[PDB]
């Protein structure tokens, strides 16, 4: 007999998949450059979106891993002896204050958990629990968000996961140092309900199920024509 | 004590992570019905298979219907296709196919159910035939008779179930490998025709469903080929 361990929900949805690649400067530039932001959602990576949308209701934790790689930037007045660099990684749960620029007061709020990671170590990790009001995240929602039967159709429901922000703690007088962030996302303790048929049409919106009418399968030569795509050889001369 | 390989990030590691939000009491789980424990629970359910995709029906419902008509057709073939899920254009789009494409090694047997969606007073016979991997397909009804066959009487019985077995030298066969004349063919032939009483339709339609038996296992998870697009949406 053959085992079915490889097809279970855990082993099917617990692969760490990169969801965001961002870059941000250190000293010089407009305020929007100096920090990197991302709202946690699973509707923008097409592969992960398809695998999650295979079901309707889901319930899981979140493990997030950050691979931050820094580098120097060409220009004028280059530093020769910066000791190290440190990064602040901030999680903003729904209902929390949000920074609008670097060096804002919101970076010191005591309600937002933060990680101070100094480069050279192992990449930083965190594990966010099931943060929601309802009893399960619902991928597909049919209805309107406001009881007056008008609003955004089937969106911005009571499911949210928060935002995540990264900033350079080290104020740098001379030179500009760029950094690149890669965010790896993995669900843990997944529970899934109400299976669905996998999608067919190409994905077109990060919030809608809008689509183009596509065919149901691939064309074939004839109704009763078997493949026979083997060239001339020792067999079938 | 510690090797330099101790300080690394391996993307397929399963270690506990520090909790960002301790002392947070999560919402208790309720009993939403219909929980699934294993994706093999999904491939064991029947799906309608588009056997009639002759390049003009893929953009219509007509792809699902196999046409059967009564007349001077003595031994003309109703339909025929190669039994290779995961890659064959007949099967690769159904539930079974789109579960298999997520995996790289597959094992077990398959089940086909033909349903005669015709009138209640139409009589005839049909000769379903199965050819093993090590054989060429039949070309005359007599050839398909002398192999493995089942005779379906559409007057007595309205549905037929045919179970295609697992024959292979090795345990797991690759999903994406085209085995020319090594997968097996299924063909159906007229035996008597179609007989109808006066005032009744002279044509019918034979739907087909394909599903998995209890015997599958799958191995080596990978990425599907169907999602050609890769960019971050919007």
């Amino acid at each position: 007999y053959h085992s079915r361990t490889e097809s279970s929900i855990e082993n099917f949805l617990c692969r760490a998949a990169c969801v965001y690649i961002a870059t941000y400067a250190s000293a010089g530039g407009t305020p929007t450059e100096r920090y990197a932001s991302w709202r946690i959602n699973t509707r923008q990576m097409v592969q992960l979106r398809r695998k999650f949308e295979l079901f309707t209701y889901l319930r899981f934790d979140m493990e997030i891993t950050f691979v931050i790689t820094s580098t120097q930037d060409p220009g004028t007045q280059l530093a020769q002896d910066m000791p190290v660099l440190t990064h602040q990684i901030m999680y903003i749960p729904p209902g929390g204050p949000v920074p609008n620029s670097a060096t804002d007061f919101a970076w010191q709020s005591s309600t937002n958990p933060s990680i101070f990671w100094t480069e050279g170590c192992a990449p930083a990790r965190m594990s966010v629990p099931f943060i929601s009001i309802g009893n399960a995240y619902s991928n597909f929602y049919d209805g309107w968000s406001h009881f007056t039967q008008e609003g955004v159709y089937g969106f911005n429901s009571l499911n949210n996961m928060g935002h995540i922000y990264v900033r350079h703690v080290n104020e740098q007088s001379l030179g500009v140092s760029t950094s690149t962030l890669r965010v790896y996302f993995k669900p843990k303790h997944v529970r899934a309900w109400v299976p669905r048929p996998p999608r067919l049409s190409p994905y077109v919106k990060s919030s809608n199920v809008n689509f183009k009418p596509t065919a149901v399968t691939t064309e074939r030569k004839d109704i009763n024509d078997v493949g026979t795509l083997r060239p001339v050889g020792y067999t079938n001369h | 004590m510690l090797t330099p390989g101790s300080n690394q990030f391996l993307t397929s590691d399963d270690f506990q992570s520090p909790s960002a939000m301790p002392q947070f009491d999560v919402t208790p789980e309720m009993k939403i019905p219909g929980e699934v424990h294993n994706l093999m629970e999904i491939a064991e359910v029947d799906s309608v298979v588009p056997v009639n995709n002759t390049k003009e029906n893929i953009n219509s419902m007509e792809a699902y219907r196999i046409p059967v008509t009564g007349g001077d057709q003595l031994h003309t073939q109703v339909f025929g296709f190669q039994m290779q899920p995961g890659l064959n254009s007949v099967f690769k789009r159904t539930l079974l196919g789109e579960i298999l494409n997520y995996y790289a090694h597959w094992s077990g047997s398959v089940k086909l159910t033909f349903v005669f969606c015709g009138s209640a007073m139409a009589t005839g016979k049909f000769l379903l035939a199965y050819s093993p991997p090590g054989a060429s397909p039949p070309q005359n009804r007599k050839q398909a008779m002398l192999g493995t066959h089942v005779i379906w009487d559409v007057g007595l019985q309205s549905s037929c179930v045919l179970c295609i077995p697992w024959i292979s030298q090795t345990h797991y066969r690759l999903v994406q490998q085209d085995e020319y004349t090594s997968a097996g063919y299924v063909t159906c032939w007229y035996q008597t025709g179609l007989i109808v009483p006066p005032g009744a339709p002279p044509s019918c339609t034979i739907l087909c469903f394909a599903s998995a038996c209890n015997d599958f296992s799958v191995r080596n998870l990978r990425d599907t080929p169907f999602i050609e697009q890769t960019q971050l949406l919007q």
């Epitope: 060239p231 001339v232 050889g233 020792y234 001369h237 | 085209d178």
Partner: antibody, heavy 117, light 114 residues
Framework: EVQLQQSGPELARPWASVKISCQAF???????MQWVKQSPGQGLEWIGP????????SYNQKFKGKATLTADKSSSTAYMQFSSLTSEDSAVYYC???????????WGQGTTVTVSS | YIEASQSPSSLAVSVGEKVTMSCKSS????????????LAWFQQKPGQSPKLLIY???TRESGVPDRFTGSGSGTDFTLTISSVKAEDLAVYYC?????????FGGGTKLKIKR
Amino acid sequence: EVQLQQSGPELARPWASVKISCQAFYTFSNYGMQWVKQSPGQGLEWIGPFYPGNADTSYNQKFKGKATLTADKSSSTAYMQFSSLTSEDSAVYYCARVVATTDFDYWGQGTTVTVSS
Amino acid sequence: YIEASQSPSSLAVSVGEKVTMSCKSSQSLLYSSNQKNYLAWFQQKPGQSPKLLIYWASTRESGVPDRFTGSGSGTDFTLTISSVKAEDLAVYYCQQYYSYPYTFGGGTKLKIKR
């Protein structure tokens, strides 16, 4: 670089069967013999292959039911039979031979099969 | 029926100029097991026996000069002559040996420009 011969160019007649032999200077081991026809225009068209050492017979659908193949490996002479010949069959009938499974290296000399109505 | 399509026009160029010709074998000619292309180019001296020049779509033939170079994969295939010659008059064909039937190309004569 081995040369290749045949029966020869002969002036035939309508409904007069033309036997074009093809001489052999090789073995009969899993290699093949075939013909093509050199018409005034559009180059060459295949007529039918025969594989000695495999007992395989095949015909082009443009000649199906109209041409037949007979071969004699021992005598080194193999026939290409035909009947009901028309006046539009006049072409240089080249005999090609292949020591391979899928190749077309060698070529023949040619025969002129023009007739006179 | 597998179809091949030659270039609509012949060379129509002077002697000694680099020339590029192409054959479009519609049905795919790449074999999974061997990664081989079953397409060979042919030259036909008018009245003499034609012979192929580049076979396997990657190999120059024995006894064939270094000027003829044929490449390509998939449905399309292309051939280049580094310098055309006047005494090499022929009608260039492309023949596929993937599957029956054996179909020739469309032809390309070495016409006169002088």
